[PDB]
Amino acid sequence: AYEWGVRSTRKPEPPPLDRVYEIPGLEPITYAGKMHFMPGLARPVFPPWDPGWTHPKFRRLPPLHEHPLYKDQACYVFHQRCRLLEGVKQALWLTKTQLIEGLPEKVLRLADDPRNHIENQDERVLNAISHARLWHSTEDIPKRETYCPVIVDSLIQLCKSQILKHPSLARRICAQNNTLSATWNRESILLQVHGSSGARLNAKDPLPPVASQEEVEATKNHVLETFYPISPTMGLQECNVYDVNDDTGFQEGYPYPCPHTLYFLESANLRPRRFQPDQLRAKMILFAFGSALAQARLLYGNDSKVLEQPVVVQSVGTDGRLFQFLVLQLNTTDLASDEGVKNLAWVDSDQLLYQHFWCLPVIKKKVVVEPVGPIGFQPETFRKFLALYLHGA
Amino acid sequence: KARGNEYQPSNIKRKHKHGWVRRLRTPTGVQVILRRMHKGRKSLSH
Amino acid sequence: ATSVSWKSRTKYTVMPVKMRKSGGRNHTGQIQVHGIGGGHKQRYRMIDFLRFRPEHESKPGPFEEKVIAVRYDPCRSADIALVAGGNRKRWIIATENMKAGDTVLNSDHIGRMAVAAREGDAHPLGALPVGTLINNVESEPGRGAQYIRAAGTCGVLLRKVNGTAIIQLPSKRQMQVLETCIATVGRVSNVDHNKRVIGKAGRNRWLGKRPNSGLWQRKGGWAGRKIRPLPPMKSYVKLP
Amino acid sequence: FMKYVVYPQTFALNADNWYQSFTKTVFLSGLPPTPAKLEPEPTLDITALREAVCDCLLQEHFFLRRKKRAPVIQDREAIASPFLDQLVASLTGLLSVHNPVLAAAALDCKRPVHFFWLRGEEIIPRGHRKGRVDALRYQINDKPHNQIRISRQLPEFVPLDYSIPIEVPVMSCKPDKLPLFKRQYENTIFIGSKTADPLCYGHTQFHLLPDKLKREKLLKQNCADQIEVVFRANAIASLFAWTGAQAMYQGFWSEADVTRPFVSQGVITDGKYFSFFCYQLNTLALTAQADQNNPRKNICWGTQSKPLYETIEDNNVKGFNDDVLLQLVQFLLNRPKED
Amino acid sequence: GADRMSKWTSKRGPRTFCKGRGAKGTGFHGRDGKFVQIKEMIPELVVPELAGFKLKPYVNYRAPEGTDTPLTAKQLFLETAAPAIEKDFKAGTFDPEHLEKYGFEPTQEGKLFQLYPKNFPR
RNA sequence: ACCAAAGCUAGCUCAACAUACUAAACAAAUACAAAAAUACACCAAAAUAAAAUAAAACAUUCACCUAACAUUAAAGUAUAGGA
RNA sequence: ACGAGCUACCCAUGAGCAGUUUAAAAGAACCAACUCAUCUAUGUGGCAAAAUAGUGAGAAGACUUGUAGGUAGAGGUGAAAA
RNA sequence: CUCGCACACGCUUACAUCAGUAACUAAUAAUAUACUGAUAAUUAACAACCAAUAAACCAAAACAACACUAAAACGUUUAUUAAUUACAUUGUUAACCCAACACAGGAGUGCACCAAGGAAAGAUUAAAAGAAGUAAAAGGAACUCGGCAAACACAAACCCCGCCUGUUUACCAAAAACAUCACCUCUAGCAUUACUAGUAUUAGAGGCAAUGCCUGCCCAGUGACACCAGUUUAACGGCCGCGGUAUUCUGACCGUGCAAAGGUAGCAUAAUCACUUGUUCUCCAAAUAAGGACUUGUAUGAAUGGCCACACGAGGGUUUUACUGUCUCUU
Ligand SMILES: [Mg+2]
Ligand SMILES: [Mg+2]
Ligand SMILES: [Mg+2]
Ligand SMILES: [Mg+2]
Ligand SMILES: [Mg+2]
Ligand SMILES: [Mg+2]
Ligand SMILES: [Mg+2]
Ligand SMILES: [Mg+2]
Ligand SMILES: [Mg+2]
Ligand SMILES: [Mg+2]
Ligand SMILES: [Mg+2]
Ligand SMILES: [Mg+2]
Ligand SMILES: [Mg+2]
Ligand SMILES: [Mg+2]
Ligand SMILES: [Mg+2]
Ligand SMILES: [Mg+2]
Ligand SMILES: [Mg+2]
Ligand SMILES: [Mg+2]
Ligand SMILES: [Mg+2]
Ligand SMILES: [Mg+2]
Ligand SMILES: [Mg+2]
Ligand SMILES: [Mg+2]
Ligand SMILES: [Mg+2]
Ligand SMILES: [Mg+2]
Ligand SMILES: [Mg+2]
Ligand SMILES: [Mg+2]
Ligand SMILES: [Mg+2]
Ligand SMILES: [Mg+2]
Ligand SMILES: [Mg+2]
Ligand SMILES: [Mg+2]
Ligand SMILES: [Mg+2]
Ligand SMILES: [Mg+2]
Ligand SMILES: [Mg+2]
Ligand SMILES: [Mg+2]
Ligand SMILES: [Mg+2]
Ligand SMILES: [Mg+2]
Ligand SMILES: [Mg+2]
Ligand SMILES: [Mg+2]
Ligand SMILES: [Mg+2]
Ligand SMILES: [Mg+2]
Ligand SMILES: [Mg+2]
Ligand SMILES: [Mg+2]
Ligand SMILES: [Mg+2]
Ligand SMILES: [Mg+2]
Ligand SMILES: [Mg+2]
Ligand SMILES: [Mg+2]
Ligand SMILES: [Mg+2]
Ligand SMILES: [Mg+2]
Ligand SMILES: [Mg+2]
Ligand SMILES: [Mg+2]
Ligand SMILES: [Mg+2]
Ligand SMILES: [Mg+2]
Ligand SMILES: [Mg+2]
Ligand SMILES: [Mg+2]
Ligand SMILES: [Mg+2]
Ligand SMILES: [Mg+2]
Ligand SMILES: [Mg+2]
Ligand SMILES: [Mg+2]
Ligand SMILES: [Mg+2]
Ligand SMILES: [Mg+2]
Ligand SMILES: [Mg+2]
Ligand SMILES: [Mg+2]
Ligand SMILES: [Mg+2]
Ligand SMILES: [Mg+2]
Ligand SMILES: [Mg+2]
Ligand SMILES: [Mg+2]
Ligand SMILES: [Mg+2]
Ligand SMILES: [Mg+2]
Ligand SMILES: [Mg+2]
Ligand SMILES: [Mg+2]
Three-class SS string for C150-211? CCCCCEEEEEECCCEEEEECCCCCEEEEECCCEEEECCECCHHHCCCCCCCHHHHHHHCCCC
Q: Enumerate residues 6 to 45 of chain B having a beta carbon within 8 A of any beta carbon in chain E.
A: 7, 9, 11-12, 14, 42-43
Read off the CATH number of the domain in which C6 is found: 2.40.50.140
Question: Helix axis angle, A87-95 relative to A277-299, nearest 10°?
Answer: 10
Q: Would you say A341 and A354 are in contact if contact means Cβ atoms under 8 Å apart?
A: no
Is there a binding annotation on residue C76? Answer: yes
Give the residue from D132, A55, A6 showing the smallest Cα distance to C5: A6
Last residue of a domain, one of C107, C137, C171: C107
C239 falls within a domain = no
Q: CA angle, corner C126, sides to C124 and C130, nearest 5?
A: 115
Task: Please state the separation of Cα D144 from the chain's center in Å.
Answer: 8
Query: Residue D66 CA to nucleotide H244 C1', Å?
Result: 121
- The SS3 call for residue D247 is helix
Tell me the nearest-neighbour CA distance from D224 into chain A, angstroms.
35
C-alpha D23/C-alpha D279 separation (Å) is 12
CA distance A186 to A180: 19
DSSP string, A332-381: E---S-SSS--EEEEEEEEEES-SEEESS-EEETTEEEE-SEEES--HHH
Q: What angle do CA A49, A51, A57 make, to 5 degrees?
A: 115
Based on the fold, state whether residues C30 and C78 are members of the same structural domain: yes
* Phi, psi values for residue A120, rounded to 5°: -120, 85
Boundary of a domain, candidates C88, C107, C126:
C107
Angle at A37 (CA atoms; ends A34, A40), nearest 5 degrees: 100
| E12 in Cβ contact with B11 (< 8 Å) | yes
Peptide bond before residue D82 is cis, with ω within 30 degrees of 0: no
- Check the annotation: does C143 bind a ligand: no
Question: What span, in angstroms and rounded, lies between the C-alpha atoms of D296 and D283?
Answer: 6
Amino acid identity, position D159: P
Closest approach of B11 to chain E, Cα-based (Å): 6
Instruction: Report which DSSP code applies to D252.
Output: -
Residue C207 lies in a domain: no
Q: C123 and C56, same structural domain?
A: no
Q: Do residues C80 and C136 share a domain? A: no
Asked if D96's CB is within 8 angstroms of A163's CB, the reply is yes
Q: Is A226 on the interface with C (CB under 8 A)?
A: no
Cα torsion at A234, A236, A240, A242 (round to 10°)? -140
Count of C-beta atoms within a 10 Å radius of residue D296 = 18
Which residues from chain D sit within 8 angstroms of residue A248, using beta carbons? 65
Evaluate whether C70 touches C95 at the Cβ level (below 8 Å).
Answer: no
Q: Are C186 and C133 in contact (CB under 8 A)?
A: yes
CA pair distance D217, C226, nearest whole angstrom: 89
Amino acid B7 CA to nucleotide H23 C1' distance, rounded Å = 37
Q: What is the total residue count of chain C? A: 240
A221 burial type by CB count under 10 A (0-12 exposed, 13-18 middle, 19+ buried): exposed
> Is C118 found in the same domain as C95?
no
Q: Into how many domains does chain C fold?
A: 2
**Within 13 A of D297's CA, how many CA atoms are on the CB side?**
19
Rg (alpha carbons) of chain A, rounded to whole number: 29
Q: Mind telling me how many Å the CA of E28 is from chain B's nearest CA? A: 27
Q: End-to-end distance of chain C based on CA atoms, in angstroms?
A: 47
Question: How many structural domains comprise chain B?
Answer: 1
CA distance C110 to C179: 9
Q: Is residue C234 part of a domain?
A: no
Please check whether residue D335 is in contact with residue D99, taking contact to mean a CB–CB distance below 8 angstroms: yes
Residues 6+ apart with CB under 8 A from D242: D113, D115, D142, D144, D191, D202, D205, D264, D279
B9 CB and strand G closer than 7 A: yes
C50 to chain A: which residues are within 8 Å by CB?
Answer: 1-2
- H/E stretch holding A146 reads helix A144-160
User: Do the domain assignments include residue C75?
Assistant: yes
The residue out of C89, C107, C125 marking a domain boundary is C107
**CATH number for the domain harbouring residue C141:** 2.30.30.30
Q: Is C31 in the same domain as C132? A: no
Are C82 and C163 members of one domain? no
Q: Which chains touch B (3 or more CB pairs under 8 A)?
A: E
Please give the distance of CA E102 from its chain centroid, rounded to a whole number.
Answer: 23
Same domain, C38 and C92: yes
Q: What is the dihedral of CA C69, C64, C86, A235, to 10 degrees?
A: 20
Residue C57 within a domain: yes
CB D281 within 8 A of CB D237: no
Please indicate, yes or no, whether residues C129 and C85 belong to a single structural domain of this protein: no
The answer to whether C166 and C225 are in contact (CB under 8 A) is: no
* C-alpha gyration radius of chain C: 21
Name residue D146's beta-bridge partners: D109, D206
d(CA A145, CA C93): 37
Please report, for residues D8, D22, D177, D189, D234, the alpha-carbon distance to residue D180 in angstroms, rounded to integers and kept in the order given. 12, 12, 6, 20, 15
The answer to whether the CB atoms of C50 and A1 lie below 8 A apart is: yes
> Nearest Cβ partner of A6 from C7, C11, C46?
C7
Strand (E) or helix (H) holding D269:
strand D262-269
What CA–CA distance (Å, rounded) separates C20 from A73?
41
Enter the resolution in angstroms.
3.4
d(CA D29, CA C139): 90
**Chain A residue with minimal CA distance to C141?**
A1
Nearest to D334 by CA among D273, D267, D244: D267
**Contact predicate A193/A289, CB 8 Å:** yes
Q: What is the DSSP letter of A195?
A: E
User: Would you say C89 and C82 are in contact if contact means Cβ atoms under 8 Å apart?
Assistant: yes
**Distance in angstroms (rounded) separating the CA atoms of residues A121 and A159:** 11
Helix (H) or strand (E) holding A387: helix A379-390
Contact between residue A186 and residue A75 where contact means Cβ atoms under 8 Å apart:
no
Mutate to test the interface with A, among D44, D47, D58, D64 (most CBs of A within 10 A): D64
- Same domain? For C1 and C99 the reply is yes
Nearest to C12 among A4, A85, A238 (CB): A4
C144:A229 CB<8 A: no
The CA distances from residue D108 to A87, A309, A349, D143, in Å, are 35, 40, 29, 10
Contact call for residues A158 and A118 (beta carbons, < 8 A): yes
D106 touches chain A (CB under 8 A): yes
Are C101 and C131 in the same domain? Answer: no
Are C81 and C125 in a shared domain?
A: no
Query: DSSP per residue over D36-55, as a string?
Result: TT--S-----HHHHHHHHHH
Using CB atoms, which residue from E1, E13, E17 is nearest to B7?
E1
Domain extent, residue B28, equals 1-46
Measured CA to CA, the distance from residue C73 to residue D130 in angstroms comes to 63
Identify the CATH number of the domain in which residue B41 sits.
Answer: 1.10.287.3980
Query: Do C114 and C96 belong together in one domain?
Result: no
Helix (H, G, I), strand (E, B) or coil at A79: coil
Indicate yes or no: strand F within 7 A of the C-beta of B36. no
Pick from D112, D114, D118, D61: nearest CA to D84: D61
Q: Give the C-alpha separation, D231 to D269, whole Å.
A: 9
In the sheet that C88-93 helps form, which strands lie side by side, from edge to edge? C88-93, C79-85, C63-72, C103-106, C122-124, C182-185, C133-135, C155-160, C164-168, C174-178, C234-235
Task: Strand G proximity: list residues 361-390 of A with CB under 7 Å.
Answer: 363, 365-366
Burial string for E58-77 (b: 16+ CB within 10 Å, else e) reads eeeeeeeeeeeeeeeeeeee
List, in sequence order, every residue forming a beta bridge with D319; answer none if it has no partner. Answer: D310
* Shortest Cα–Cα distance, E22 to chain B (Å): 20
In terms of phi and psi (left: phi > 0; alpha: psi -120 to 50; beta: otherwise), the region of D219 is: alpha
Q: How was this structure determined?
A: cryo-EM
How many CA atoms does the CB half-sphere of C176 hold within 13 Å? 12
* Domain-located, residue C235: no
**Structural domain that includes position C132:** 108-188
Other C-beta atoms lying within 10 Å of the C-beta of residue C98: 19
- Buried-state track D299-318, b at ≥16 Cβ within 10 A, e below 16: bbbbbebeebbeebeebebe
Please judge whether A1 and C8 are an interchain contact, meaning their C-beta atoms are less than 8 angstroms apart.
no
Cα angle E92, E96, E101; round to 5: 85
Q: DSSP letters along D273-287, please?
A: EEEEEEEEE-----S
